[model samples]
Target: KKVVLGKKGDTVELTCTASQKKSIQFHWKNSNQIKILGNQGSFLTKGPSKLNDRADSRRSLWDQGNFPLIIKNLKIEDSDTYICEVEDQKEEVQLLVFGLTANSDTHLLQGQSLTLTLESPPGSSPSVQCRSPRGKNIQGGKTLSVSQLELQDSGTWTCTVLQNQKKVEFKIDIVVLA
Candidate 1:
């Protein structure tokens, strides 16, 4: 899996690879499902549909069979999650995207706080993100619990962690009403 960025009101295309001589059955998907983009050795190709139509406009792919995902007139809502996956014989692999879902969730409470934890991912730099979602709103947040927290001071009240500038996991919804 790799990373690619699609700009607003522009077309975004992502290519996914597969094992040698694989069927090349490709589909674009979000964190939810495999969206059809294009497939090799197939007929009737249509793609990148939304669960809702009349409520929303749709996009399509330009090529088929190992085709990349093309998003037309891309917007923030179109930014969520997307994947180009391929399966071969007995295994399947996919490419994952970021940014669009960087803040997977939004709308933080005025005084809400959450703790984000991070750990190195296979030879990658180590970092974590802990924030007070309201952005600069002071409350309380910690990246690690009381124990097993690799970097105790890896966080403060902002965001951004890890050597490669990647955010692995985060916590941003703390309810103090009890």
Candidate 2:
């Protein structure tokens, strides 16, 4: 399985494409080069919310955006390098690490108002959420980037201001509409 996107508190999904029979192998690495977060023998577990639980197949390789080891409800502590692999027909075990990024393979177009939001503010407490009906909001992550529009980009947006931070809450809707 290939482990692609690994943020501090996000899911780490690993994917692999190979034999439906041969035993699949999973591995991980930290940004700090974590080759053995588990026993030196290389095995992880699943259970409770603690690391003490033994890893089972629940930590799987199944239908998940093409990934198997889909770690959910992540935390900053979940950061790591994950890899998925399996022995190929060539008599060699193939391995690859997964990765996810904004520079994704998907193509975006203009006028695609992506609902942006603020997931975490590293320096402050939970502030007011965005009031916009469709754009990204505090419930998710911030730094909202709206998309291709004509007139809707010209209006005044009422951005909110954090206590000591910049006054952030505003709408910019122009008259251009497609």
Model 2 lDDT per residue over 1-178, tens place: 2223323333444444555553344433333333422222334433333322322233233323122444555443443344433333211111221111122112333455434333332233324344433453333234444555334333333334343322333332223234
List lDDT for all candidates, in order: 0.38, 0.34
Clashes of each: 4, 55
lDDT of 1: 0.38
TM-score of 2: 0.31
For model 1, give the RMSD to the true fold. 11.3
Give lDDT tens digits, candidate 1, residues 1-178. 3434333345555555455463445555666664544444453244546622211211232233244455456443554445555554221222222221223133233333323333222222233344443443322222343222222222333444333322323333332221
Q: What is the C-alpha RMSD of each candidate to the true structure, in Å?
A: 11.3, 13.9
What TM-score do all the candidates reach, one by one?
0.38, 0.31
